[PDB]
């Protein structure tokens, strides 16, 4: 019950070389059950008044879930009923990125007037900021318009949350006695954990 004073994503990925595709599902299930427990055991119908926005491990859990979902959706190319929509420009980007990686690893109106008409009237580098701004705006519009892979992960996490809620409903007494044990005894190790699993 006492606060503490961060990079668990990289250790799991570097320790996993030929891991299973089913353990990703278990990692996602284990990284998203605290939110299920908090939403369950908090009493309903305030206007979301007792939520605990922007603290330590919720952001880390969300980041880990997003990373696991990205890893699972980028490695699809039975276990899963369906697959990702697979935007028809992904293979060009992967091929070009692999080619570039292998290549890397294989090593104001001109105030002076013109005396001749051959010379220009405005300097070539006068309007470069406007061109860059237009290019950046066009690139932003193009990139932020083709995310067809934002609704599959939402429903995947939705089914994960529904299963976690349905499982935690049956074992509500377990979490009850467990959080009471954490309430009285200020620390909770694995021995007390397994004893309270009764």
């Amino acid at each position: 019950i006492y606060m503490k004073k961060s990079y668990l994503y990289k250790w799991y990925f570097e320790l996993g070389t030929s891991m299973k595709k089913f353990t990703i599902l278990l990692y996602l299930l284990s990284c998203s059950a605290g939110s299920v427990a908090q939403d369950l055991w908090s009493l309903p119908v305030p206007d979301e008044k007792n939520r605990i926005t922007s603290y330590g491990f919720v952001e880390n859990d969300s980041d880990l879930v997003h990373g696991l979902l990205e890893v699972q959706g980028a490695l699809v190319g039975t276990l899963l009923f369906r697959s990702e929509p697979r935007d028809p420009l992904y293979m060009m980007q992967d091929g070009s990125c692999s080619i570039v990686d292998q290549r890397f690893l294989y090593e104001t109106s001109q105030t002076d007037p013109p005396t001749s008409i051959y010379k220009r009237w405005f300097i070539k580098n006068t309007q470069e900021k406007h061109f860059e701004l237009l290019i950046q705006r066009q690139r932003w519009l193009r990139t932020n318009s083709s995310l067809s892979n934002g609704f599959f992960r939402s429903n995947t996490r939705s089914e994960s949350y529904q299963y976690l809620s349905n499982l935690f409903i049956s074992n509500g007494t377990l979490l009850d006695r467990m959080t009471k044990t954490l309430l009285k005894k200020r620390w909770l190790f694995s021995d007390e954990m397994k004893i309270g699993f009764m």
């Binding site: 293979m91 060009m92 992967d94 091929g95 070009s96 692999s98 570039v100």
Partner: protein, 126 residues
Amino acid sequence: GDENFLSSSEITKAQEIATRMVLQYGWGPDDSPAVYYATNAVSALSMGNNHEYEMAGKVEKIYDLAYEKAKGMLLKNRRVLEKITEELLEFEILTHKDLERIVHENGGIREKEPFFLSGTNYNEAL
């Protein structure tokens, strides 16, 4: 339920090979001599905005043709593959001679020349 992360590196290599032989060497699905990339290049050509989808479609087409060809030539020797798995599991050391024996006795149907990924455009030398 038993999926593989071991073959991902071959999948990425196949995707790299497809985009190379569509863009660089001009060995497209329609045999177009257009070249958009070079060995010393740091980027590609302009390629527009509505023309990248055509290139992606060609790359997906040749990738699907390669996958279909591999699937067709590997589903004909399923018993051969099962026997190789069992013998590798029981012996842990394999030569070329026992594999030749396996592809001989188990009715291993080998392929034949010419080897094309799409026979709709194949020609012959003079």
